[PDB]
Nucleic acid binder design. Structure first.
Length: 92
RNA sequence: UAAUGGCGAAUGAAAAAGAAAAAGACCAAGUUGAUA
RNA sequence: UGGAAGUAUAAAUCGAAAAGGUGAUAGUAUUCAUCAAAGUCUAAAUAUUACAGGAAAACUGAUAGCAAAGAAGUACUGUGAA
RNA sequence: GAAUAGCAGGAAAGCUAUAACAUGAAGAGAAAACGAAAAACUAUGAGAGUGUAGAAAUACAUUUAGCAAUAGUAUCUUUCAA
RNA sequence: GAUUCACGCAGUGUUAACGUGCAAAUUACUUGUCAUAUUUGAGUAUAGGGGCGAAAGACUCAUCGAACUAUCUAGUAGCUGGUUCCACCUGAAUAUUCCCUUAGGAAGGUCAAAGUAUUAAUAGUAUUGAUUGGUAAAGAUAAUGAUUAGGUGUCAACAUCUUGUCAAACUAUGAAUAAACAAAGAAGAAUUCUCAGUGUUAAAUACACUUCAGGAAUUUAAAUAUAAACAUACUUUGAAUCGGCCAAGUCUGGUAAGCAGGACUGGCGAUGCGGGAUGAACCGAACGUCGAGAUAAAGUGCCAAA
RNA sequence: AAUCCGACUGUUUAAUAAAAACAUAGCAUUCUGAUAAAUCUAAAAGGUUCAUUACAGAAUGUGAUUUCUGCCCAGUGCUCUGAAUGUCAAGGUAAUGAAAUUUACUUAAGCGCGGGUUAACGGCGGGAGUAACUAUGACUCUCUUAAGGUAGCCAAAUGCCUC
RNA sequence: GGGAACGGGCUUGAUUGGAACGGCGGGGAAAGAAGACCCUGUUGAGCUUGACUCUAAUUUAUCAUGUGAAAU
RNA sequence: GGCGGCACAUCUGUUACAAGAUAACGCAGGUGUCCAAAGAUGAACUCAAUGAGGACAGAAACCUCAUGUAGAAUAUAAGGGUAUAAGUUCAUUUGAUUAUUGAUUCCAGUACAAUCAAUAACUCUGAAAUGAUGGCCUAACGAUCCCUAAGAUUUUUAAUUAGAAAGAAUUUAAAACAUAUUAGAUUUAUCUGAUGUGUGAGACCGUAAGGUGAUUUCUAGUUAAUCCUUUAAUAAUAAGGCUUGGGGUGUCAGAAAAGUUACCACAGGGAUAACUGGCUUGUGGCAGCCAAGCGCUCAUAGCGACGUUGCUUUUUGAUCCUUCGAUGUCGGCUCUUCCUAUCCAUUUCAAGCAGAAUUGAAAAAAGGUAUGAUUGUUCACCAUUUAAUAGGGAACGUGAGCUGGGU
RNA sequence: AGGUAGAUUACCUGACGUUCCCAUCUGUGUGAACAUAAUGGUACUGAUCAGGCUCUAAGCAUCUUUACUUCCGUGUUCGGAUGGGAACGGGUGUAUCCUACUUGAUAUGAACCUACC
RNA sequence: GACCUUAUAGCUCAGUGGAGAGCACGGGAUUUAUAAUCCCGGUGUCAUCGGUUCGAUUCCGAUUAAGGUCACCA
RNA sequence: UUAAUA
RNA sequence: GGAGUAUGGUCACAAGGCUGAAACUUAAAGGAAUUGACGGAAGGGCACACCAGGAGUGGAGCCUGCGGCUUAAUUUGACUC
RNA sequence: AGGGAUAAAUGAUUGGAAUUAUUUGUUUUGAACGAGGAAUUCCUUGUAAUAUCGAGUCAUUAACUCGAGAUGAAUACGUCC
């Protein structure tokens, strides 16, 4: 919901409690060279139409929130998942 | 079996290794031109 | 296609060489290994339920075995394929 | 009775071939890389004797061995993890 | 592209005949129509997701909301029908989980057949002992609610004392029936001596675990009832089944139902026999082939034994 | 003697429907100047209308005559003699990198923007009050649509209530 | 009467002489046909539509090098 | 069946039967969230309400005392829990973290999810014991493949210096050409033969005990690489692996999916509707019991309210037991029979029966109960006639008996 | 006899009055510092002038309450069992289990370690 | 019956987590007088009950009225 | 610009 | 007036044209012209009529007249200039 | 301290009679009223405007009317809106 940046959480790499920078995880750009994409492009080539199912029955309205808690001094990034919230905001 | 496949249902070879039999020869291009 | 960032074929476009191809994860480089495409022929080992001639059988024995053990693809049906 | 190669007999039968391989003897890992003893321990358990007595068979006392099975221990190989 | 009759033709009516017919669409009378958008022969053209159609999905060889014929093809079917000798032994199911599941599957329960173990491996039972629960009942200025009145004190109103009647989604109290233990298995007890490794600890000789670590002696078969050696514990492989139905000193929805759905048990299904005249379930009692007797439910005027 | 439908002559479900159904003449709309329009074919100096040429060819609705065809371009179609820098492909160009790759810029139709069109598909409102007894409401009020069902006609083969 | 709740057969009664001709239309829940109505199949087919995925025809752009020039 | 609804994933109370399990399209409701504080900890305080007082101030503003078992509050539905608190206020804080195990709840003793018990780190709060791995408890959620992020540096190697300890190493037939040096040819991005050494080489010196010596080991600094793979060897890009999260399937153990057939077809079904029959009798029809009253007086000549008890299957419901390899589905026509809850004729009793006409009731079902306009009608409404023109059953009597008007 | 720490958590609570304090405990004086709040009221710290006035503790009462016994009552209900009675509804008989509410009598605490008196 | 929507001045509608518009009505002005015109004012239980509510006319259920759609195969 | 009635 | 209406006849595709009454109702309807009045008709003049301004009234309190209300009576005349 | 209504306790006048205060003094009471909306009135020089005096009515009672003087603006010399 609301969560401030600048957390102080144990960092496994340094084995110590260090300040940590909290952000939100966004899915990266889908690549055209991963194996699953190359296989899908090959299948769609040629006659036969859509060769793979297309999801069309969405029911969920929200998504689980993943924070990217990052070591300030050592760049070790953790990932903490939060429960589904309709409105999420990064506080002060 | 490796692999392929709404990686689902299914599809799917080959070198090695062991036998049968065993066999190699030509054009083109190049050279010789009192040229055939 | 088992061949997965393309194994094989074909089409449209493009198109080499003081050579080059392959080493199946795309790319560049340096080594290594192995071949030398884009013309041709070639016996033997292999297949066979056309058909012909034979020999066998833990096969059938006239509603069985070929549809057909007699003038059987005959009698008979259909415009015709059948 | 892997193909296949020989034998007598004439044989879809029979006999013989130090042999490629299949499954197994070693297991874990995606893979690289690896690859098993404290010559084991504990518990209960199969069997074998001696003595006494009832007195027909059999019923007790005591000595000994402790396999299979189950359970639990150390130890060792592999795995991020047994 | 006027009105009618005739040769012909069609098919309006009888919804006549016939309806295993003369006929796989015909006959009789009636009606209509009977030359120019007329009738008709031969030749010719148009062919299957095609043709042709003054349009009915009509016609395309008795076949048309997609012909006929052959191959794929013995197409697939969770659906329907059938599935072949005798005797003997054992003998079921409708719970639970998941499925595009609901006329069907897989895990699992019930069952059968094979194969084992001397076996810390018996119990749909009762008793004694310590418990658990919140049902039946009970209560109603005992908590939360519901509701009829009567006194006393400061019209009502508010306090306070009684009375009458109630709660599946109220409760102090709380049965009967039940549930889960114990009644002597590191292997049938106890005591004495000696006693080690860790750790707890302030330190321990306390304490905890270690085959009640271990080792040795003496004593000992005891510790509710009943039943149980063709007992007990199973292991492996697998069949069928999960449409159910009835009864009731039971319950829920419904006016009610031979209605619909549940808790516990017993049955029918899978089951014949004696009785209720007859009947899937009721009562007695379950079955190798027979003889003799005593019986059960129930009966003894005749059918009908008494 | 009347009522309904179809104007008429004609055709129709071979074998249960012969009719109000189909055709019809008449009316109306759309496209096309032939190297075209419609349209058959896998392809084709291929084929049909077409031995034709807008008084023609092709595609549709209504169905003689008389009288008349009202309002609506918002929605979906169709169209434009129309706009540019909204969105839009393969490509083309350029840059970095050793290279694949990656990134940026630029590209047509189409959609979007604007207009036209209903004899294109189609559509064409609600409440309340008030006229010297009682009704009815010529009349105002105000919510609202792209337009509010116009001329006509009616318990109609079209009206539940309804005999 | 009971039963699958409408028996020719079973139970209790009523009652019966063997073979039948012409009619007849009550019954044999008479014959004809694996219900055409309804439902269930993860069985179809015709037809419709911005149902999903495609496709012929139509359309637009690029490539496929005829010569000689000018503007951007 | 369709329309409606979700009893499809899911929580609370009750049905529900004092262990566990547990039905209905049974009842009353609930979820797809919300929270940097509403998580953690420490301290202080006590709530709702009532009484009595205080200028404006009153029923309700703010202050004070007293009583006050929670009648307040605790994010939410309901039920549980809570008073030096789990409620209010104040203060610090991020344990709402990383790694590894063992169990309990659904359970097939599978997965997901949830509920706990410990261990190893680093931390928060407190003086401390303790407490802290999200919310006081019961719901608030999700596979394979695919996409997308985080992590694998604690360690192991090679090379090179210093020191130290063991260490023969296998044994004759040879080509690639890195080249030098010559014999020819050539001008181009120049080639073609042969001679040559090394490369590339490996039989250690011992009849003297054995030393030397490649190659390997340990320790101390140095520089380099360091999760695995792309299979001839490396490199920097790329791609694939391993562990853990997110993106989702609500039909919630998870296909990618619009209608209509009256032109319809097939495999089946009484597991399942439209007709009879069967149970029921709400509804319909008929009949009773009591007696507040009406009936000028008079509860009962004739009725009979408020209540209450029955019968019938002639209406429609309710169910789905029989029939889906078929029981021909409305009405009318013709014809027979049966019931009485009797319309007429016969015999009686009663009256608010003077006569006539009537009304209530008993015996009695042997006999009669009609003709037409409209409608397919059953039904109905009209016009007559009659002594009366009553109500019903028989597969809603009766289609190899008719008709085919309706459906 | 009193104080500290408790265990059982009303026989321990609530209301009305009552008795000592000799030690102990409490109330009691004060604000300089630690510390504290709006307020030395609380909490904090320093102290000893006075008092049993309230605490606290012990006792009183036809005391509400609470805790055991009897009775209520073998009355409610219930496990088992008919070809037992009734048109139902419901309720016997048999071999058994057996509440609750009220009411009456009784009680109002017992007990553990340490110090002092 | 089943789903959906609405309910606010005397009449038609607006808008609502702390009630506008119009028409109507009343008073004053202009006019010989009415109508029109100008000026000012008074008008809403937000349909009736419960809960969330800081606080409801708004948010959540209920009871009413008012309409709209469906009520099919036999 | 608008200007109805008795 | 009814009325160029109804009906009948005829002409026209139609609208309509030609011919064309009666019942009933009613003391007036109408023509030219005169005088006045009026005109959001024209022309010529005038007025604090307006213009340029002043003071104001209308808004407050009170005095006073009128309407209304009240009362036994609130006596009455006058209602644009 | 502008404003002097409204109320109070008291002193006298005229009158036959003063309460519903005839008129008036004293002290206290201290209200609207911050230049006034739509509209509308009068005025051209000793005029408007401002404040006062006399007279009519008059036993008592002027904020009324009819007159008189005191100070002395602004604005036009126009036009038919």
């Amino acid at each position: 919901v609301v969560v401030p940046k600048t957390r102080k959480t144990y960092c496994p790499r340094c084995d110590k409690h260090t300040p940590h920078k909290v952000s939100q995880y966004k899915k990266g750009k889908d690549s055209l060279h991963v194996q699953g994409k190359r296989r899908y492009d090959r299948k769609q080539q040629g006659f036969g139409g859509q060769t793979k199912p297309v999801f069309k029955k969405k029911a969920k309205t929200t998504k689980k929130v993943v924070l990217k808690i990052e070591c300030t001094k050592c760049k070790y990034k953790l990932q903490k998942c939060l429960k589904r919230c309709k409105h999420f905001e990064l506080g002060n």
